[PDB]
Amino acid sequence: ALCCLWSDWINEDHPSSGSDDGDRETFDGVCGAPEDIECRSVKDPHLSLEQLSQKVQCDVSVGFICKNEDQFGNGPFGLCYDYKIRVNCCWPMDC
Numbered sequence: 001a002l003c004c005l006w007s008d009w010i011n012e013d014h015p016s017s018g019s020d021d022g023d024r025e026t027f028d029g030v031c032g033a034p035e036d037i038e039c040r041s042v043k044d045p046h047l048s049l050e051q052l053s054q055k056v057q058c059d060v061s062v063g064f065i066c067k068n069e070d071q072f073g074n075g076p077f078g079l080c081y082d083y084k085i086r087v088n089c090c091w092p093m094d095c
């Protein structure tokens with residue numbers, strides 16, 4: 001069968017850190033090919049993305065991407081929340 005486990009939280013980028021003007025989280029070095037991914041805001045971790053307001057990308061191919069300019073605001077106001085991810089990874093095991 002397949003034995004699947006959820007990783008610890010990954011939170012290596014932040015909306016006002018680095019040079020990417022956003023928040024990107026990857027599972028490189030954690031799992032080779034996640035079966036699932038969970039992307040959550042740090043300040044409201046119980047809300048799924050379908051319960052959040054921001055424009056983000058969250059999938060098992062690229063991981064998590066939020067770009068600050070995609071968020072609601074006028075002028076320079078408005079940016080990504082800080083997000084964190086878990087990945088669900090499965091191993092072929094007889095668990």
Ligand SMILES: [Ca+2]
Pocket residue numbers: 013014015016017018019020021022023024
């Ligand atoms: Ca950043």
Ligand SMILES: [Ca+2]
Pocket residue numbers: 011012013014015023024025082083084
């Ligand atoms: Ca982050």
Ligand code: NA
Pocket residue numbers: 055056057065066067068070
């Ligand atoms: Na975005």
